[PDB]
Amino acid sequence: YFRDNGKHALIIYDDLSKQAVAYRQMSLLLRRPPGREAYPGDVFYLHSRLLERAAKMNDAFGGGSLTALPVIETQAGDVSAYIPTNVISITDGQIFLETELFYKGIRPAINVGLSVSRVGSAAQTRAM
Amino acid sequence: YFRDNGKHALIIYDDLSKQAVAYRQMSLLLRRPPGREAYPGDVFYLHSRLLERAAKMNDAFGGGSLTALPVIETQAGDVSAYIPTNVISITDGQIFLETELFYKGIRPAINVGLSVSRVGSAAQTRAM
Amino acid sequence: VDLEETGRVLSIGDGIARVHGLRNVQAEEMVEFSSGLKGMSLNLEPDNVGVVVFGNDKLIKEGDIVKRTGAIVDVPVGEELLGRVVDALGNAIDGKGPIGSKARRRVGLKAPGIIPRISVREPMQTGIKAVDSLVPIGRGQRELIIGDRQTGKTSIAIDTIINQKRFNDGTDEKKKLYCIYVAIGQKRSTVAQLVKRLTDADAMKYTIVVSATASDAAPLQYLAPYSGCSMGEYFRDNGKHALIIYDDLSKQAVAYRQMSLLLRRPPGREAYPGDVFYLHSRLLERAAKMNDAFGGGSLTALPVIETQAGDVSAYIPTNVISITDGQIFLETELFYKGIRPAINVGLSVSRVGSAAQTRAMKQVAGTMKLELAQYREVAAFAQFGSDLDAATQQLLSRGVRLTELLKQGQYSPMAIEEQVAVIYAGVRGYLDKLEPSKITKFENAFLSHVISQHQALLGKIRTDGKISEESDAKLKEIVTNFLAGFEA
Amino acid sequence: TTGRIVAVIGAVVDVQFDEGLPPILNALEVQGRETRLVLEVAQHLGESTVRTIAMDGTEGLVRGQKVLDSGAPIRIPVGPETLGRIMNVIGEPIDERGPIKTKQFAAIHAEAPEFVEMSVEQEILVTGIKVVDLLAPYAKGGKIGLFGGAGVGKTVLIMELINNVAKAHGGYSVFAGVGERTREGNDLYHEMIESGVINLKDATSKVALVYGQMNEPPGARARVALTGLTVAEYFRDQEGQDVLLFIDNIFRFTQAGSEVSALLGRIPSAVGYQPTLATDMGTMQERITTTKKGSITSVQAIYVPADDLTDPAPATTFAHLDATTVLSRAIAELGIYPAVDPLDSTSRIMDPNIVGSEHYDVARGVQKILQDYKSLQDIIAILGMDELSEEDKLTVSRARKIQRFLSQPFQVAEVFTGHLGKLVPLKETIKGFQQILAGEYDHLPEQAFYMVGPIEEAVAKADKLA
Amino acid sequence: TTGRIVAVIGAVVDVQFDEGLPPILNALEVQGRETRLVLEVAQHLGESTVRTIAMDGTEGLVRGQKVLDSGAPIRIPVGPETLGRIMNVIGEPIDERGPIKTKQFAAIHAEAPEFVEMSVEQEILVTGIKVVDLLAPYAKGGKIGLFGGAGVGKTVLIMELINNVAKAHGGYSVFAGVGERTREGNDLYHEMIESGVINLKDATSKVALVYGQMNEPPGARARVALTGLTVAEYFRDQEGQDVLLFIDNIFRFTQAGSEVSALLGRIPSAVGYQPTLATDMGTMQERITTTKKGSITSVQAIYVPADDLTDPAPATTFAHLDATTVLSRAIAELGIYPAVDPLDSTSRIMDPNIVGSEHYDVARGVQKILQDYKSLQDIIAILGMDELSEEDKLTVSRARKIQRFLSQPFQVAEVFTGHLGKLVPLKETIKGFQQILAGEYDHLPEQAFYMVGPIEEAVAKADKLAE
Amino acid sequence: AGVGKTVLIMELINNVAKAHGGYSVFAGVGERTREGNDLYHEMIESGVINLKDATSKVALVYGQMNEPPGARARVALTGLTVAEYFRDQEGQDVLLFIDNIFRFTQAGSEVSALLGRIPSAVGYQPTLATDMGTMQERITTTKKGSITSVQAIYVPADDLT
Amino acid sequence: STTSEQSARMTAMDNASKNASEMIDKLTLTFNRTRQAVITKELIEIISGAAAL
Ligand SMILES: Nc1ncnc2c1ncn2[C@@H]1O[C@H](COP(=O)(O)OP(=O)(O)NP(=O)(O)O)[C@@H](O)[C@H]1O
Ligand SMILES: Nc1ncnc2c1ncn2[C@@H]1O[C@H](COP(=O)(O)OP(=O)(O)NP(=O)(O)O)[C@@H](O)[C@H]1O
Ligand SMILES: Nc1ncnc2c1ncn2[C@@H]1O[C@H](COP(=O)(O)OP(=O)(O)NP(=O)(O)O)[C@@H](O)[C@H]1O
Ligand SMILES: [Cl-]
Ligand SMILES: [Mg+2]
Ligand SMILES: [Mg+2]
């Protein structure tokens, strides 16, 4: 609504891991053929169609935007798991928060080397 | 009968792994739903019904007893397998036997660190 | 209402036609739809017939007639197939005139029993030193090739075909070997490049190429090894010798799984059917060595299987290992280290053994297979730089330089005598003092020298098929005087 | 003639026909929609009913809704007028530039070229990327596959190959966006307008764009790959021209197949996939090839789910390729970009007869010293580099200097790296790694080789440090 | 009574009867066939219909084709006229030497011997194989099982046991070739004719062959194991004689069950197998036994899919065995043949009261030094040999020599080894591993123990390696 | 057990009943009938249970292991309802001891299987998060009072993930 | 030499303890992911065969 009215919105899905679990529940009760971690084939499509709707519109459409900050919960830092890679493969970068850094006192516990922004520099002020 | 009528008894189930396979065969061919390792949902209900009937009676009902020594064959040391996971949690204690200890010269090959009796000292004489 | 020789399609989808009627149809019988496509009647049920479709199912529709052939699936057979590239049903697909052979043979015939066979003894020379010495193949034997992607599996098969040219230009009929290469699930550009390779070395003239590529339907990929087997079984039963290469049976198993799953047959292990072992067992058993009473011909098989992460202890690899008479296991670790061909010595075996070798090779590579297995055990054991006795450092010194001899390039397979010559130097201990890195240089200089001057000695080993005490003394004089030149 | 919807579930819609049953693969028009909703016939169920896969969302569909037989498969515009234009699965223009006025059309389901039509000539294609050119080089008209896990450099790599080849390549191109990001499509479109390869004023465009991205439902992602081919199949056959065919990402074809197959009600294969994974891939992939009539050089980005190359989707794809550039997260995390595995990447032209014996020896020499270094990784992980012997430490120091010299700054990734983009010729690619193997830079440090073009820059970078 | 075929899906064939419905296990004869085609009734589906499994290939079968009921299960030839001849699953000759000239037949299905029929004798049977005799020796009148993955020496071992034990044996024998290689059937058949164990002319043949190989469909492989043991059951009870019952491979009985299980309308059990694995194995394996009336010494080759001994098939087989010889690919990979796992193979008779304390104490000493070495291997690969104690690297050197002295060149395996075949007596086996344990050959090198018969050959070979 | 687990429970019952004026509840989710006997009589002898007068500081709710999956599934909810009285109706800060919470998950996995629902990853019920969530969200603070809960965690295979 | 040696060993074996410690964490998590995968994948086979009759 804000995107398609020349305004700027921010959305935070907290968290898409729990949503995926809920969709696995619905899928397995429907007796649909499961796969990795018992998830269905469209668990990628679940998140892909959601996060695709976060966009930056042109001036002809109003110049509005919807910015997405989805959340995922990894098990012991495993970024290579099914659902983490699925959402990594959808989004335009990541903010990896490492548990070892949180324990020391580095807070917020952002790993710099692992974290990426794919369209970042363009949307960053000349001062910074 | 021995337990009820004052006396004490000892029972050895050798083994509950093979009993579970027999019960699984029936449950699969009666088309009951197969769970983990193809066993039915009432496989814990099966072994817990059996093992709970072993008991130390008080003086009023007799004073007698029935003592269970069930056996469980693990596969490649996997004590976390479905049927071993059941009978471990049901029972009052475990005597873990391992292949590496057996051929090392530890015979009987009982793991002291992992084996446990939750009753413990209460079933010992002051000498021991 | 005559729905005995004819029948109507109830439903078509994913290559599985369900046919009403056809009361008098047989199991595994070929049938023909309205459009002209062929089908196979694999499921006979009370109210329908499950027919697997050889081709694109767009041509089949509901209410289409299905006529009986009255015959089991069968393919063309004979000498006219040689030099030609065909598909799973023997139809020519190389821009040339069609297959004009008069004889014909069934695809799904059972293998010969105990009495028609005789034990394996005639050598089937691959021209690859690591195979011929360590894991020798005989005529009628079944030797699996196996390993990860790009480990050199097909390359073992190519040289084995190209090595037969030396024999096939001669006049002796029992010396000849007519090859077959069944391509299951590959792409057409790869099979085209493979045929180009054989035609450059003039190998096609005695080679039949059966091509069930990825774009072809699952039944054609399923059928193609059995079709090519029946083309080889013609040579076998009429007193001639043939080779066949199923490249590969993993891609065949995927095709068979698709048919079986879409015929609503409950799948077993890893989604494959219960009878996935039986799929490969009945194919390979047909490759055999016949006795003199049945003409004395043979069919030698070389199936290929793909592994994942170098795991020979997996369900499908172990199935095909449990059928075949040994295997040649390749590894990516050994490949990139320079060990090419990348044959793991311990994991590879041959179950005919020295019975399938010549007497010459039996002398020089008699106890070489086991000695090389112990070398890798001892070399891996003493990786740390500790002191060792003279007997174990000799085993390491020997084993390193034997491995450098068994290295070999491709598109240049060696004759049995020339293999015996180069293996002599290593096993009899002349290489031991030289540096490991110069062993490949030694071999090339030694091989080109014996080809130049000593054609009588190489010829005498080829004629006799052994190393005499005369020839032993000549080689002893040649290598010792050669070694003194190299060491300086 | 006319049909009626009987059931609907996701992308799978069943349609009954009173008279005249439509054959398999025919496009069916749903009557009464704002946009055009195409249903493609997948099966005949029986009792005059056919199962179909929709090319757009099935929301709004009611049982008994009218459906027409188009009388053919999904036909699209193909020709010179497709260049400089974007189109969806069904050939509709999606760039707000009106009709695509072509003279011909073409069905997206054509049978693949027969064995008779196969070319066998393998000519090398110089990329400018060292690991590719050195170890697993591409061939002109060859099938090229870029395997990669989530976020390791597939799209960066395929966009670098567009920059190096497509401009230097005097011929047409095709980019088929199969199930990736719609904003990346916007990035491609407006990059190509600004660069010159697409021209809005003129008709001098060198690229035709096709797009069915991860916002689209499964039936669309499953067919959009084929729509991209059909455009490239015209330029190959009907003009006799050399073609580039970029596809990002061909995994989404097979992923989408898993989504429809579930709803089609089949028994699944291993890892929850469709039982037709290999045959669906075959009929698609065999059309992507260089025939006798014309040349298609095809670069396919291949997503690897959960970094697992043993997964059925990537595992089957290997067979359909002439060169494989296998990316790695392990290599990416250590800073080496592009993150190519030199021991898991292969090419069928890596042959001393084709590339020349000097090339082959330097490639296999690099792979030997890399594989020797890999075998020591269990011992180096625990104790360290210092605990090894003098012979073993020398191979490690060279291998690490090789691994860093295998890295290179890309022109498309100047924002990420910071370094200026480089494109190393084939002569200096062989020469650089040839010197390192001989041991002419054992004295130089490791990080001097990290992110440099030719071997000359490795000496220049090392001198500034001291 | 006459019936009609109603369905054919692979080896599974459904048959409908109007009047007389045949019971389970009954052999049904299919008419209109050139060769004889038996169908054994497995289940009753209902509606006057029964589900069967075919003993030969089903190709050519038509719906409505006539099927007669024999009124009995599969009955095969039994008696001393079977000796020298090769049978198949349904009791026909496959050797081309006329009919099996006997007028007495036995059904392949039968109840296993009762508990009262069981014997408890267990005297040692010395094979001449060092690793087997030392660590996990076999017993006369006892069940022996040869486990192993694909290509580790199960057949090479079982043939060597036939070479060593069966030739020097007064009583009869039976080799049941269940679901393995027709080539190996040919090899055995003509090798026994050479040695005079089978004689084509006179009636002095000791072994009776039975074969249903991997060229056959599942019904054949699922029942040919039973066929073979029914021949041995006659030689046990009716004769009263020591029978040797070799089986290769008894996994194929269970495998053949798993191939058809889906088509019989069963939910699969763990790892794709039938629910009826243990009960089907039980009614078969319990018949393979020694009783009061006669002694059977049964050697059975047991395949292990994917080299995983936890697999339902081999996992269930262990309990049926008195002695177990487990083979490993890991050991065969190093050249150590026979590739027996010394820390996995076991026997019931390994007791100081049965084989004596001097035998027992050496066998455990070998297992200890090998087991202690197995733990070290992984530690000393990283941290190096020089960190070990002098007591440890003594036990490392001794262990590696003991591993090699467990290896042995077989006569049947002469074509693979390149070394002459050797049979080591039990006395010289025990003394050999006694001396190596005590440290009497610590001065001698490592490779002298590899691939030799007695301990004496190590001393001689050690001097040969000097030059 | 054997590290003062049952002693720690009893003291938490004792101390919270004294200071905060809040009673407790014990829910034996898969109680070993032998250990149900021991916990009952140890609570009597200590003082937290009183048999003669009404100064008892715990309600006990046992769903023993020999009972079917339906029993062990819902026995946590039964004891939770006893705590809901003291919170809602009488405004107390209540304790709810659940032993064992893995057996609540396990009993749910058995029930789901029996009904014919297809299992999820590692054999657990597809409704694992909801079955947990519908129970755990009742254990919370309200304006009336609260229900705090000590829960016995069994980690299968020593795997936290 | 020996005062440097004992310092150099104490340093290297402190790193060898930390490296092995992080490898236990990596391997223990890989063990569990494989453990759960084998239980899941085996269960999918049973359900696939059961809902196909
Ligand atoms: N003996 C050899 N010496 C040198 N190079 C070799 C040798 N054998 C194979 N190669 C090379 O290794 C690569 C793979 O060979 P190939 O025979 O295609 O293996 P493959 O396993 O059949 N490939 P694929 O079936 O596609 O996984 C080719 O580029 C060959 O040139
Ligand atoms: N004792 C031995 N000595 C030398 N070589 C051996 C020995 N045992 C096995 N081999 C080698 O390994 C091969 C496999 O032996 P074999 O007995 O056929 O294994 P298997 O376990 O019976 N295979 P399968 O029945 O297919 O599961 C032999 O043909 C030899 O080449
Ligand atoms: N050559 C390179 N130089 C510098 N950075 C790179 C390079 N390649 C990849 N990256 C980094 O990795 C990120 C993701 O790369 P990308 O090209 O999106 O790979 P991908 O596999 O296509 N991603 P996805 O589609 O989400 O799986 C980029 O935004 C860069 O930060
Ligand atoms: Cl003794
Ligand atoms: Mg190949
Ligand atoms: Mg990308």
Ligand SMILES: [Mg+2]
């Ligand atoms: Mg065998």
Ligand code: NA
């Ligand atoms: Na590079």
